[PDB]
Amino acid sequence: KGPPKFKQRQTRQFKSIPGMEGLGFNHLELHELAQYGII
Amino acid sequence: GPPKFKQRQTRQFKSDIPGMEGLGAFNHLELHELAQYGII
Amino acid sequence: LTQVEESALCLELLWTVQEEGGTPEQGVHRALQRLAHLLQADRCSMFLCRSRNGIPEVASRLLDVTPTSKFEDNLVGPDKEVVFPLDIGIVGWAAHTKKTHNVPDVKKNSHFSDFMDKQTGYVTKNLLATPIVVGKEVLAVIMAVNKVNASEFSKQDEEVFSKYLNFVSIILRLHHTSYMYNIESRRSQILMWSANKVFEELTDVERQFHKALYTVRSYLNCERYSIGLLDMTKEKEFYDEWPIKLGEVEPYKGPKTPDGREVNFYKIIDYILHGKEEIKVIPTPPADHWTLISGLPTYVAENGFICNMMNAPADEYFTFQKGPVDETGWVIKNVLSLPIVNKKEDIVGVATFYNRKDGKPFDEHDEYITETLTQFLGWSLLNTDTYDKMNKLENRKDIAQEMLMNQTKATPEEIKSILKFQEKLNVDVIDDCEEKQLVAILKEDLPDPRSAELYEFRFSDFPLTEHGLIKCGIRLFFEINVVEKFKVPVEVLTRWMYTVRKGYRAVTYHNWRHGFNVGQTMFTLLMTGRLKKYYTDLEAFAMLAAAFCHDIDHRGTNNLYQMKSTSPLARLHGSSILERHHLEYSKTLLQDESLNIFQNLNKRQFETVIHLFEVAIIATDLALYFKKRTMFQKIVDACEQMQTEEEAIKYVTVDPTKKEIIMAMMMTACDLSAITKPWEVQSQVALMVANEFWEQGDLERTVLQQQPIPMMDRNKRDELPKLQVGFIDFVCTFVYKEFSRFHKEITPMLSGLQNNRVEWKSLADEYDAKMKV
Amino acid sequence: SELTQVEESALCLELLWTVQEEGGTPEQGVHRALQRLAHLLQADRCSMFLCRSRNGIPEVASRLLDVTPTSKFEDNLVGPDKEVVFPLDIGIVGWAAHTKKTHNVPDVKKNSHFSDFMDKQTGYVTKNLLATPIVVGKEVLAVIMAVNKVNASEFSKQDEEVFSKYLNFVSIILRLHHTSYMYNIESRRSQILMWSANKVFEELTDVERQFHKALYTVRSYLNCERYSIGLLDMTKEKEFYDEWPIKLGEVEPYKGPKTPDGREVNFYKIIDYILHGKEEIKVIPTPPADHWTLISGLPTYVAENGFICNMMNAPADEYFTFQKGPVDETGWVIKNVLSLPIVNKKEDIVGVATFYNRKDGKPFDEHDEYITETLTQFLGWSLLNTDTYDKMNKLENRKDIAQEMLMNQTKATPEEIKSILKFQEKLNVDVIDDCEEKQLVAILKEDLPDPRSAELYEFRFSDFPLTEHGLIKCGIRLFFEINVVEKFKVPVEVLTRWMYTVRKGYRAVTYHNWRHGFNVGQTMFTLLMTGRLKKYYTDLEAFAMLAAAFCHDIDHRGTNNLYQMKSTSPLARLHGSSILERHHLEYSKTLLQDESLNIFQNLNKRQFETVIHLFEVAIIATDLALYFKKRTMFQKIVDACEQMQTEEEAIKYVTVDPTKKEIIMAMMMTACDLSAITKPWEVQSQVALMVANEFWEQGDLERTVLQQQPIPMMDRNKRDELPKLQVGFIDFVCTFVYKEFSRFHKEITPMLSGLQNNRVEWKSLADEYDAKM
Numbered sequence A: 001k002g003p004p005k006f007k008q009r010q011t012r013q014f015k016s017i018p019g020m021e022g023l024g025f026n027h028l029e030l031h032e033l034a035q036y037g038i039i
Numbered sequence B: 001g002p003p004k005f006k007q008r009q010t011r012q013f014k015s016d017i018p019g020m021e022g023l024g025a026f027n028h029l030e031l032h033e034l035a036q037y038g039i040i
Numbered sequence C: 001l002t003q004v005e006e007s008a009l010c011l012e013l014l015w016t017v018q019e020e021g022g023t024p025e026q027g028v029h030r031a032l033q034r035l036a037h038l039l040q041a042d043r044c045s046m047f048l049c050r051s052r053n054g055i056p057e058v059a060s061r062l063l064d065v066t067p068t069s070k071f072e073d074n075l076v077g078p079d080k081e082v083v084f085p086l087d088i089g090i091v092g093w094a095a096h097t098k099k100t101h102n103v104p105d106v107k108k109n110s111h112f113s114d115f116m117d118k119q120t121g122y123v124t125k126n127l128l129a130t131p132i133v134v135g136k137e138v139l140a141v142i143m144a145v146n147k148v149n150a151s152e153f154s155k156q157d158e159e160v161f162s163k164y165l166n167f168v169s170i171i172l173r174l175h176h177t178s179y180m181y182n183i184e185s186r187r188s189q190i191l192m193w194s195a196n197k198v199f200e201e202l203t204d205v206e207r208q209f210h211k212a213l214y215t216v217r218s219y220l221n222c223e224r225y226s227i228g229l230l231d232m233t234k235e236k237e238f239y240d241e242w243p244i245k246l247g248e249v250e251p252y253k254g255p256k257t258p259d260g261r262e263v264n265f266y267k268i269i270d271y272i273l274h275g276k277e278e279i280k281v282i283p284t285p286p287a288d289h290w291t292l293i294s295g296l297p298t299y300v301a302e303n304g305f306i307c308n309m310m311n312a313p314a315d316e317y318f319t320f321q322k323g324p325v326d327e328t329g330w331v332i333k334n335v336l337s338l339p340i341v342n343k344k345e346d347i348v349g350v351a352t353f354y355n356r357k358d359g360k361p362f363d364e365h366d367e368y369i370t371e372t373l374t375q376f377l378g379w380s381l382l383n384t385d386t387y388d389k390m391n392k393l394e395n396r397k398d399i400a401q402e403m404l405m406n407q408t409k410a411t412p413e414e415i416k417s418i419l420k421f422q423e424k425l426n427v428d429v430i431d432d433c434e435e436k437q438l439v440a441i442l443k444e445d446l447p448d449p450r451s452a453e454l455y456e457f458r459f460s461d462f463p464l465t466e467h468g469l470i471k472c473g474i475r476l477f478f479e480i481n482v483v484e485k486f487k488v489p490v491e492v493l494t495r496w497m498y499t500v501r502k503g504y505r506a507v508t509y510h511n512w513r514h515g516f517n518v519g520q521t522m523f524t525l526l527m528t529g530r531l532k533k534y535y536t537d538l539e540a541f542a543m544l545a546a547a548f549c550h551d552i553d554h555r556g557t558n559n560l561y562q563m564k565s566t567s568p569l570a571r572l573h574g575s576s577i578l579e580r581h582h583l584e585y586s587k588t589l590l591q592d593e594s595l596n597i598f599q600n601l602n603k604r605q606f607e608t609v610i611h612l613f614e615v616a617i618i619a620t621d622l623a624l625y626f627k628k629r630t631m632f633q634k635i636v637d638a639c640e641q642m643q644t645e646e647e648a649i650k651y652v653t654v655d656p657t658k659k660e661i662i663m664a665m666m667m668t669a670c671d672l673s674a675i676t677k678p679w680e681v682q683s684q685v686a687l688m689v690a691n692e693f694w695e696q697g698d699l700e701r702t703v704l705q706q707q708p709i710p711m712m713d714r715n716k717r718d719e720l721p722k723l724q725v726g727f728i729d730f731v732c733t734f735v736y737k738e739f740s741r742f743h744k745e746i747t748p749m750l751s752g753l754q755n756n757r758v759e760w761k762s763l764a765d766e767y768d769a770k771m772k773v
Numbered sequence D: 001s002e003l004t005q006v007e008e009s010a011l012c013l014e015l016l017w018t019v020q021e022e023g024g025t026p027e028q029g030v031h032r033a034l035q036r037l038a039h040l041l042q043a044d045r046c047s048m049f050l051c052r053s054r055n056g057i058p059e060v061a062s063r064l065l066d067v068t069p070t071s072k073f074e075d076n077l078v079g080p081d082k083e084v085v086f087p088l089d090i091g092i093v094g095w096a097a098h099t100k101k102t103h104n105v106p107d108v109k110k111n112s113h114f115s116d117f118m119d120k121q122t123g124y125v126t127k128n129l130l131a132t133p134i135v136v137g138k139e140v141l142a143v144i145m146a147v148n149k150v151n152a153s154e155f156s157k158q159d160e161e162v163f164s165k166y167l168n169f170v171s172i173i174l175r176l177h178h179t180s181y182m183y184n185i186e187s188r189r190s191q192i193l194m195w196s197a198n199k200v201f202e203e204l205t206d207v208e209r210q211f212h213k214a215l216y217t218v219r220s221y222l223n224c225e226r227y228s229i230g231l232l233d234m235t236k237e238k239e240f241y242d243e244w245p246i247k248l249g250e251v252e253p254y255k256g257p258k259t260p261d262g263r264e265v266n267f268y269k270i271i272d273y274i275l276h277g278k279e280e281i282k283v284i285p286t287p288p289a290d291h292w293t294l295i296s297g298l299p300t301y302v303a304e305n306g307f308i309c310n311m312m313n314a315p316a317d318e319y320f321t322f323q324k325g326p327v328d329e330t331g332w333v334i335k336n337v338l339s340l341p342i343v344n345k346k347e348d349i350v351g352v353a354t355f356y357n358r359k360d361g362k363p364f365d366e367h368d369e370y371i372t373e374t375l376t377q378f379l380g381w382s383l384l385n386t387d388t389y390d391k392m393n394k395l396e397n398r399k400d401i402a403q404e405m406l407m408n409q410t411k412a413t414p415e416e417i418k419s420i421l422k423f424q425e426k427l428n429v430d431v432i433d434d435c436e437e438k439q440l441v442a443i444l445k446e447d448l449p450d451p452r453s454a455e456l457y458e459f460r461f462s463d464f465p466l467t468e469h470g471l472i473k474c475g476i477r478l479f480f481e482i483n484v485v486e487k488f489k490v491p492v493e494v495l496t497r498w499m500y501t502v503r504k505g506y507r508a509v510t511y512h513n514w515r516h517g518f519n520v521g522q523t524m525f526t527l528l529m530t531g532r533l534k535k536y537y538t539d540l541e542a543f544a545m546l547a548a549a550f551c552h553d554i555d556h557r558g559t560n561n562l563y564q565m566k567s568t569s570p571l572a573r574l575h576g577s578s579i580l581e582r583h584h585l586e587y588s589k590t591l592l593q594d595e596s597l598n599i600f601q602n603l604n605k606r607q608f609e610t611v612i613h614l615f616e617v618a619i620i621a622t623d624l625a626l627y628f629k630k631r632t633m634f635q636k637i638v639d640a641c642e643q644m645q646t647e648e649e650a651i652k653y654v655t656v657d658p659t660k661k662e663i664i665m666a667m668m669m670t671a672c673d674l675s676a677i678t679k680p681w682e683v684q685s686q687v688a689l690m691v692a693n694e695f696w697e698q699g700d701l702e703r704t705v706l707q708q709q710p711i712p713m714m715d716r717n718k719r720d721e722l723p724k725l726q727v728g729f730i731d732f733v734c735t736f737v738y739k740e741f742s743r744f745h746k747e748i749t750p751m752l753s754g755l756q757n758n759r760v761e762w763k764s765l766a767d768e769y770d771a772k773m
């Protein structure tokens, strides 16, 4: 005959976050270190 | 002194399974010769 | 009391039981107010019972219940309730024993506590306590005190007491069961949503924890809560331990986790929900942070206890903020702090939940909900560790593959060895010359195909060196005129040929010479065998390129050895292991812009090239050929019955499937072409193949501890010729006879095979003469 | 009527007390309430019909029938096997439950809502009806009816009022039971989610093992007599050689059940959980169509459509052809079935879970569908963990393959070793090495360069008149010179292969090629020997120190750490700090892992741990930032050592503290790494030009691909600033190291002296540039 009526899955319940944007040496030496790529 | 505080619960959810031991083209004469040559 | 007013009053309490919406406190007030008139007593009370930190206690809920007194005055809010431990007071003793208690002369009782007496200024002399008990749990204790005009009370006083606490028990059981259902629904929803957000995707500790804690904010009835994540660095670098080991800096003293790490909160995510909802992520928070102002998060990190605190600023150990902290008037009242633990029991974070929305102190049920949430978050760290390990594996794989191309790719000196622009263009610095000049000079330098016998089926690579084989391969690519048609760069083509040469290992048989022999054989089939008629120029360009790279990076072992040794190749590719490896490496070589001979092709032409590469290289193995022999045989039989040649050409070329089958059989004929060579070449190549098989057999006998088959056994070396006869009669003869029938121009190829069999028969016969005596 | 009211109140009180008997059922209380209502309204056969919801549609079923005064409860109760089920759109009961209002019909024949099925079923005639639904929280629980008033033909208002009054209390008892049942349901659901999360995060495994773990753990909470799960084959696309017969017309195309995305419904595995007896569990791989789960079409229907199928009286259905008799020889008859699909992230059907008849005789309510749907959703989400496990396995295998291929390409071939260890031209021995080790040592020590010649011991050594093969020979000579090959019995062929592989690991970059590594190794040798620093270290430490000095810059790409950070290189993502230094250390240890390259093969395990730690310290120390951080500590060590007037006592002061030895080693490796500044003027000029050229190439490439302006040190357009800039490098970095080493040891005085000479020359070029302006 025919199949009985059945119910569809309730995927609407989980079908679908603030704050996630940022969530994922000597004083004289620093200039010369940046000059030579040491840092 | 500090107040008395509850101890963490780990024994109940600490907790082998049966049935897990096993849960992890050619012709008639060809089946022997394919072996001799390493074809399979 | 007469029976009629008793029945009317019973109906009144019956309608009282049916709340149909409302609060249980009103119904309990009504019964208690009725009881005093039935007991001729005053000041009945309720003492609701809770459990915090596993320690039970009682707290007053209704007080000064006297007949006809308005409810608002009798109800005691959470700000003015008094709490008794079960070892203090007759209420505590009754809750402990779960039995009805009635004692006169309370000053002579050993359990009576007078703290409420001095607190309220009221004196009690005769009392009656009876806890409401359901399911081994005491919900409330009902108290009736100070009988008027009499002492010692009465037995019928206790009888009507029990008969009205039956109504009280009905109301309290209803409310408690509804409350338990609500908290269980909240817990199930918390688990469900946390699971959904964890299984959304793979992320680190911070993002996963933030998603899980933000989604479930509606089910944690807390005004504010936060999570602080400790540093997980177990050991320090050598140079950071140099100042400590030298004694120049005093060793760290202070808070420490049970594993021994220093208590350093690297980030603290605050969820403020009481007014406007905000989420604040503070990396490396200061010690003045409102969560960290008290020592409770540090205490939890040091100890790992689930800390419940009611009236936290009233404590003396923890320096909780007595006044408002964020200048919004919000004041800490109740605190609950739990640790989140790694499988190895390390404390990863501390989750602190501040004062409850209802205003009541945290009881056993909120501890249950939050403990389940923190247990789930602790278990969820497998996904974070797997994410980190995935990133490490991917980076290491990319690094290893990059250092392989630098090693495999031909150096510019090797390119200049073939395309000698310098000695003939006087540029010597940059390849700024026109492609026409490069094509011309390479055409002069490359050897003549006719003199080298590159067009014949008898071609042997024995006289030539491997550099000569590279030059002959570039000449073969020039002969099909695909370099000018598809605008193949000359330097790129030379670099690709040299890289394919360097990709082949130094194994006994499957070296660069085998790859060049297969490529030259397929060039012979296309040109001398006249099999090009079914294929376009682009298809021919792909097949000679796939022919040259069919056995690329062959380790010298069979597919059976890959399966039996459980090599990474076998665990990566299920079937046709080495063929899929060769296809993958050829595609990897073609991905480079400096090596891609198919640079100047459309997307559809490149997709055709890749599909042809797949078909040609996968068809190399003999299992697929042994399975698909019959379909090629049927194609050949169908093409034999045609009256004219162009009808057969159209019949083959209309269906791409038949072209694929013919290409697959051409691959099979090419990788087995060494049989069709003259005897002076076939003998050498057969000894090479046998030596490779014997080396594999030695590997099987030594490593796998298995006895090899007679093909790969050294001790059966004198059985080599007869096996070769079988190898001719079982594998090669079918494809070569079918191709001889298909094209008469391939007749010499098959013919050569027939000769080699004659020789391999004679070498067998001598053995039969040697073993006979 | 005073006695009447007293009796009614007492009877209602007893009816409410009956809920307090633990271990009973609410049906007893409802039955006694029904027998008293009938007595009250003078009626017979009062009935209660419960309400259920299956497949999303509501229905009513029999729970209490033929209730009359003085009637046995057990006879009036109707079991689950005799209950009659009516949909809401049929029957007076259905409309009473639909409207959620009181329905009093005096003549049942005048209503089109009448259903006579119960009249025909038992041969009873019905003429009067009064029906009420029990509605709390906007949900219907049961429908209560009084039928066939014996002494009247009509139910009056007073009768309806008494009806409402008594089923208010009936509603109270039903609300209590319903709240308890829903609490139990949510507790089971939360436990299922909790345990499934425990088992999923326990380990990263495949689909089968993970699903089996989760299902066997939540076994106790499914509350079903038997259930199974059948997993479909997820292979979506066929191989080309398996598609050839389809496209040739040889084999007819498939026609049958198909998964909605388009796949073939092929249950490739079934796991049966038997719970009615012996707790048997079976795994059927490749189950047949005769399997009792698959004998009916329900699992195939669920795979084809993705519905949730709730079936009561399954064998009575005509569509699915369920088994009417016992399924197995053991007596078990399928009664109620609940089948649900498991759904992937892309909404594909992965498995079908089928739950058979409940432990009690009742059918599957909506709450069991709720619980099982939550379980299947959790499994479908954990499919992400399974997919990540497979992707991790593929990544690990691909990384292993790439590393093996790279090691084969990098390792020195036997021909290259034969160019240094000429075993044949001197011993007349075949390729197979059966020679004694001492013979190999003797014949290698005659073919290596003279240490006293070529100034291998001096600070003025220049590699310009030496070819790179000569550099390899000189390095093996250096290893022979510190007397570690015989002391630690390392193999000679292993040492030669290790050094040739180390040379081949260095790329062809302008400055950081193999010559830089050899110069640093040679400078380490001279600092140890000529600089007299060997007195601070043991022979093993000198061995590991030389080996770390040679590999300190292995596989250098010509770009510094800043370019690794800015371009987001895989090295930068894998290693956070000291990117290139950690890469060099990792690759050196990878080279040492192979037994044919393990130069530390024959030493103890503790010695190997010490050697690995020294390797790490020495290689990481070449990061210049670390040198700028620990230079002060080295200065303090030198200042402390300067004050002692005895050499032995300074040696003792350094030796007993391993931290001091490590600090001195780190600056020894830094002093070696910058040794080119101490070379004579021609060598320094050429090497400085090479360094500047490499920096200019890095700057040009940085500008080309990063779109960033290079610093003037790496900018080509500032090439005329090379002299002046160089003096800054002399005044800022190198002078501290060499001045403190000259203070610490007078024998390292020449190095600093050479530096000062260079500082003159780079000044003479600098001032001239100021004259050029």
Ligand SMILES: Nc1nc2c(ncn2[C@@H]2O[C@@H]3COP(=O)(O)O[C@H]3[C@H]2O)c(=O)[nH]1
Binding pocket: C043, C044, C045, C062, C063, C064, C065, C088, C089, C090, C091, C092, C111, C112, C113, C114, C115, C116, C117, C120, C122, C124, C143, C145
């Ligand atoms: N003010 C007040 N005190 C009460 C009431 N009911 C009981 N108490 C007292 O509060 C006390 C708390 O501790 P106990 O158990 O010793 O004894 C209890 C009585 O003495 C009440 O309704 N009002």
Ligand SMILES: Nc1nc2c(ncn2[C@@H]2O[C@@H]3COP(=O)(O)O[C@H]3[C@H]2O)c(=O)[nH]1
Binding pocket: D045, D046, D047, D065, D066, D067, D090, D091, D092, D093, D094, D113, D114, D115, D116, D117, D118, D119, D122, D124, D126, D129, D145, D147
């Ligand atoms: N034999 C019998 N029939 C009943 C009893 N109670 C109700 N019914 C009838 O059963 C019927 C089922 O369908 P309806 O809703 O039309 O109406 C119901 C009544 O007419 C009972 O106690 N015994």
Ligand SMILES: [Mg+2]
Binding pocket: C510, C550, C551, C554, C620, C671
């Ligand atoms: Mg091959």
Ligand SMILES: [Mg+2]
Binding pocket: D552, D553, D580, D622
């Ligand atoms: Mg370096």
Ligand SMILES: [Zn+2]
Binding pocket: C514, C518, C550, C551, C620, C671
């Ligand atoms: Zn091949």
Ligand SMILES: [Zn+2]
Binding pocket: D516, D520, D552, D553, D622, D673
């Ligand atoms: Zn260096």
